[PDB]
Design an enzyme around this catalytic site. Structure first.
Site, PDB file in Angstrom:
ATOM      1  N   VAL C  84       0.881  -1.161  -0.040  1.00  0.00           N
ATOM      2  CA  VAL C  84      -0.044   0.030   0.177  1.00  0.00           C
ATOM      3  C   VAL C  84       0.744   1.262  -0.103  1.00  0.00           C
ATOM      4  O   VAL C  84       1.838   1.499   0.989  1.00  0.00           O
ATOM      5  CB  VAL C  84      -0.816  -0.144   1.227  1.00  0.00           C
ATOM      6  CG1 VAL C  84      -1.747   1.056   1.215  1.00  0.00           C
ATOM      7  CG2 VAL C  84      -1.608  -1.213   1.211  1.00  0.00           C
ATOM      8  N   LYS C  85       0.823   1.840  -1.125  1.00  0.00           N
ATOM      9  CA  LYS C  85       1.338   3.198  -1.202  1.00  0.00           C
ATOM     10  C   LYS C  85       0.767   4.227  -0.140  1.00  0.00           C
ATOM     11  O   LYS C  85      -0.595   4.574  -0.393  1.00  0.00           O
ATOM     12  CB  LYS C  85       1.789   3.781  -2.562  1.00  0.00           C
ATOM     13  CG  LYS C  85       2.586   2.968  -3.382  1.00  0.00           C
ATOM     14  CD  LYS C  85       2.667   3.507  -4.795  1.00  0.00           C
ATOM     15  CE  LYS C  85       3.989   4.315  -5.099  1.00  0.00           C
ATOM     16  NZ  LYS C  85       3.914   5.060  -6.067  1.00  0.00           N
TER      17      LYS C  85
END
Lengths: 221, 220, 221, 220, 220, 221, 221, 220, 219
Positions: C84-85
């Site tokens: 997850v950025k």
């Protein structure tokens, strides 16, 4: 070398002009806003508080070149010899070019980059003011930017000087002076720290004690 | 210091000449080709779009020295004071020598190496244009080549200047200017990035807010 | 060392996975927006185009930590092993801390400063992605920021790696790799320039000509 | 550290294998072409001329990955343990990946850039061969490229070594060895210059004269 | 670290073995010639003058590899554990390779270059002796050559050490030791200068005077 | 690496503990004085405001070693695991030696010099806190002193860490972290500047606009 | 700066004098020997092949000073303005001193060391020619020797210039030019490599293709 | 640059004045003592052996300033234009000050430190002579001392020059010349090594062989 | 370059003026106090002990600028051409500005920082005296401060020179001279160490022995 105070505080300018060798006073919109006195009141007061000599700087508020030129003419009618600070944007550069044509000294302000700063000098600004502490605070290096900018001005725009601006510590002012800046503007808290040292006060105390314990006074005859 | 735009886009040259302190405009064959207007049309238009002041650069197409000299005379009849760009090859150098004899300013272009660039200056070119991003992209260092080239010109051909060309990022333009280049030519996308910063826009916004919240307006 | 493509272009990922040793593909909101296919369509396609192995990265859109954690759970239901950025803001850091607790790999993105980047690593991110060309373009130095960030991660957060992102030239990718980055993500135009050189093509041509002019063909037996 | 000769000259390999500590011999297409003997003749001869010990390198000729893999299988049927040299292009990298899968040692050749070289190592090559003198000659720096490439391999592909190739002077070989290259391949003229020095011959002459003028002979 | 004296002077070796922590004694042809005593006399004397402990070095005189191997076998019959010095030439390298096979320690001598020195180590020499003052005197840099050579040995031939040789001043010995040489061999004039200082003698004099002027004697 | 807040402001500690990965909170006499709440009130509150996990630091007030040891025992009865801050003077060093004997963790504070700092570590302190901005302000170099001090601790007292203290700008915190400090303590104004950047806010705005102009919302499904 | 070709090949001098800006041609004994034409034939031919302008260099053969002075007078009767090449030996230096007295320009050749080179300049040589590739090949550093020699000439014999000689690669010529040599002499194979690059040929090809695909030809009107 | 020989050997001065560009000859007490001829004999001989041109240096022997001034007047009556060497001690400095007043050029000798050397220049000496090899030998750095001393003279006493003295190797002379010394004085063994190289002799031999094998002679 | 002795010891000034090339003598309050003779006695004595030539320096004692200017006028009536040392404080800088107006040479003393020192030069001081050993002793670097200060003066106040002061070792004096200081003031113990070396005495002894053993005398 040109030492400037970065304040609208008229009382403190008159006090400190007795102490520092001041070339004048720099203002920006936030510094005028904090003072709550408008430009046609505070600028003449600041001019009088340095004994009617030395340079003032004030910033245009307009967004367009034509508007920034009118803002400049308004400032020049308040103080005849004022230097017009102009933020270095597309419209900023266009105003600096027009103001060179009319023969009104300008300063390229709100400079966050060396390339940006050089463009303002090439456009005609005779001062360029990188915001040292802001570059420092926004993850970059104010000292690197000032160092690079001074090198660029000395090779590519010799008519211009860095006026290093925006200090939270005297180290920042020293590193700008060591990198070769021919002008600087100190906020009052940094200027105070630059002249008052505990170590010096202790040296002076010891000189008084030694002179006392040998001649019975602390003065000369 | 001499700031040049690297474009055949007449409209953008007129807009940006109001903003940048331009010494003129540089062209190459690919940049003229992209514009789709030929030299006898676009060069006078570019000249007029900077208000009839400052320098133009355009490139010869011929393969032989004799042919490059004829290409030069054709360019000088379109724009009287144009600087002739000549690619730095065997035939290129020979043309630069002939053009020095006739007294026509030249620029050594398509320079991928410092030694190559210096030979064009010694031959008579008064500008030398290393292709910074291309050297960078082809596994080398454009900044090292420009730095070395500028040092060579300043010791061995003082009459000549580096005109750094070919940028994908403003950092490349800054590193060339810091290495001492007395001239540079920016494509339009890099020139735009060099004058518009989010951080500056936020500083100006805050100045307006502070002036508002103390004097009730945003003007003088 | 982990080589990533920075694209939503499914066709080009399948073509280039034959050539480059890819560890996976990175996405951001702008790159997904350009593709015009939504996340529940494009992510499974990107996953299939690298043969159902290797890592994907996609960015949360929410403004609050609680919202960024929900965005993360949505991404993990599309791709079970996705990283997850999370943009590195006040709310970003809070989300990274919560996501470490739940055991979901995160990457601190939109990093314009070394200090900012280190905070995201200390918070729990196992990748930190300084936007190299953007720092470079906005008057600073992407290489300096990446160099400083890598040093900080190696002293103060050894669990984390720099994933250098945002390149306009292969030199930028080389300087990041030389500064020690254990991961990098190339846009397609830069990846192409990194493997195709005129000088190499001329060397291969000359090898064919020499082999021809001595054995009468351009092949081996 | 692995010292290689860069030649198809069988006679000179047998002479010099007595003198140098050789790990083997490298070939390229131009070097085989100059010899005018084909691969199925010269490779077994070169293998025999180092006494059937140490490594050989030969280059694929094909333009496509599938073709480069067939060229590799042909080389492996001539010399069972040969290392397949593959030029580092789009098709080159794809072949190196396929050849890693099949378990055939490869070397990434025709490397003019550090980034290019690292990609070949990450793809599976266990040697990477920057053409030092060619980079040097084409306006760049072979030493910079080799130095950068060695650093990249040691951080990002520790399984791989630089095999520095293409020397016109022994200084180039020394600077590659000082930058840390764990393998190098010398042409015959450079290898000769690296072991024969006038200053050393004068030192040996003086030792003979002093031993003569004290014991009446020049031996033990 | 291994300290060696560079002399055939038996009397001076016995005197100085009381003072310096000696690992042994090095000889060359010129140094044996100056002593006027042949190898079968002087080597056993030198061995006895360090109390029968530590290493001796002597140089072969022959021009061919086969001849240098015979010279080695002759030296090993005089002193069983002697290290054979071999000049680093074409024939030198071939002898070093043969001597490694037979299991006789060798030293590559008459080294005027780092590349030359490394080849002798790769060939099997466990010491490499650049002639520091001679490189210095013949227009080059002995310190640069020793520094480069030590780096090369530590990366590419870790089995080998630099034995720095040939000093006119103690500074040269210090700069070799600072560059990391794990062995060195001092001529008698330099070894003397390394232990006797005017400034130290003055410090000792002052200690005696202060002890006198407080206790009325110069002893305990 | 150990991140500390340098404040007695309980409300701000609870807010920021959600965001930063805090190892605890540092106090000095001036910072407790500014808060106007005494130690037996504010320390338990500060302990509760980080959720009862991580370390507190508070300073002795006494002039003599015997007095500084009693001040330490008083602090340890308020917070059982508190680290006692001791100014590095003649009497300071003697107290640090006595406190090592009793087995109470100490920190050498008010360090204006590398030599001074090392003596406190050798005496038994497991933290040493050079006053970075004060050294900087009093004509010297805080970064040089911290760099030298960290080198000295790593060679001559490996059991000890630099806890860099006293910042007016985030650059100062970054230069201390780059010089290798394994712990740091930020005042609230510097911690805020370290996580909020205009350039990042603009990047996030643009991500929302691009996602909007392609999918018609600013959220994920 | 003075560019020289290092050859007796008359045909190649005439071809390349059209391309390079030549100050003249240098010879040595080996280069004259390879040409198989004696000095009274080849020197006038070489002089004519650069159009009767610019300088020639040829070497004395004699072992004694008196003999080297006679060799010089013989060369000056073939070419009136020739510069006499003198090897820097005991006898060499003595000849250079005598030739200064008579007023005949000399060049100190066969220089393998900076000190050696400086002595020839102090003796009266106005050029000094270190054999770059030979120093490089014989285990030393030609670039270090040239760098040192140029520094020595500029401090101690400003009347003299380095004429760097003996190149196997263009890098060697570039490093000598970067170290500040005011003159250099290229063999034909190195001069060729310095002006013909594959990468440049590809750039020119692409310019022709772009001009073709837009105007239907590859020429100007 | 001023090149000096450091000897009382009249025969060798006459031989070498034909070869080196000599500005003159330096003497010290030990060098005059070794020659066994007194000052009123050897100085006029040395003056005649350089053809009556260029400068001589000789050292005072006295311990007191008044005595050193008398020693100076004695030297000036032997050689009218001689430069008087004065050791840099308390009494030395006082003599240099007095000798400046009378208008007799002096040189500050026996300099083991940069600060010491600068004081002699400020006192009036127009040469300052650090003993390079002695500083080197006594555990310090002659090159550092000469480098520092030259910097000090150029900032604080521009009227003065370093005359670097005392060499065991030509490297020491080169490092002093590279550090900027405007004068140096070579002992005969170092001067010889500075002009005769084996590598140069081999280059000259090869030139003769090539000229022979093409024209049948070794002359013009 | 200007060499000064840092002492009130009249006898030692007369002895050492024969040896060193002195530009004059510097005093401070502690150095005058140690001597126990007041300024109107010791200054004329010090002036006479260098033969009536070269410069003297003495320090003001007052706390206010107006008071420091009066202290200056008192010093100028004792020695007409004296340079007035002024500590660099708020009041110090104001006095330096006033003293520039009246045309009285000043020196900015008690300088512990480069920025501090530059302000005194810009204010009008023609000397600036960083206390090298005190900076060194108080955990900082005297050499760094002197180096930085000299750079600042040469770019921003070229009218001014560093007068490096306060040495416990000759190395400190050498590093200040190498950093470019155009003036320095040595205490007597450091000046002595700078001219007397054991190694030099041994070299002179050996020269006498060699001359003896060859000519039978030492003349």
């Amino acid at each position: 070398m040109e030492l400037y105070l970065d304040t609208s505080d008229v009382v403190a300018v008159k006090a400190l002009s007795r102490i520092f060798p001041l070339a004048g006073v720099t203002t920006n919109p936030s510094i005028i806003a904090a003072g709550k006195k408008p430009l046609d009141v505070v600028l003449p007061q600041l001019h009088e508080a340095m004994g009617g000599q030395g340079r003032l700087f004030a910033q245009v508020m307009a967004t367009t070149a034509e508007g920034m030129v009118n803002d400049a003419l308004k400032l020049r009618s308040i103080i005849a010899d004022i230097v017009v600070k102009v933020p270095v944007t597309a419209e900023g550069l266009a105003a600096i070019k027009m103001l060179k044509a009319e023969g009104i000294p300008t300063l390229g302000t709100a400079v966050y980059g060396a390339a940006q700063g050089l463009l303002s000098a090439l456009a005609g600004a005779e001062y360029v003011a990188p915001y040292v502490n802001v570059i420092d605070a926004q993850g970059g290096s104010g000292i690197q930017t000032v160092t690079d900018l001074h090198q660029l001005l000395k090779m590519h725009a010799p008519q211009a000087k860095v006026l290093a601006a925006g200090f939270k510590t005297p180290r920042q002012a020293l590193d700008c002076l060591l990198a070769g800046c021919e002008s600087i503007t100190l906020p009052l808290d940094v200027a105070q720290q630059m002249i008052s040292y505990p170590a010096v006060d202790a040296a002076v105390a010891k000189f008084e004690q030694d002179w006392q314990g040998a001649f019975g006074r602390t003065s000369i005859t």
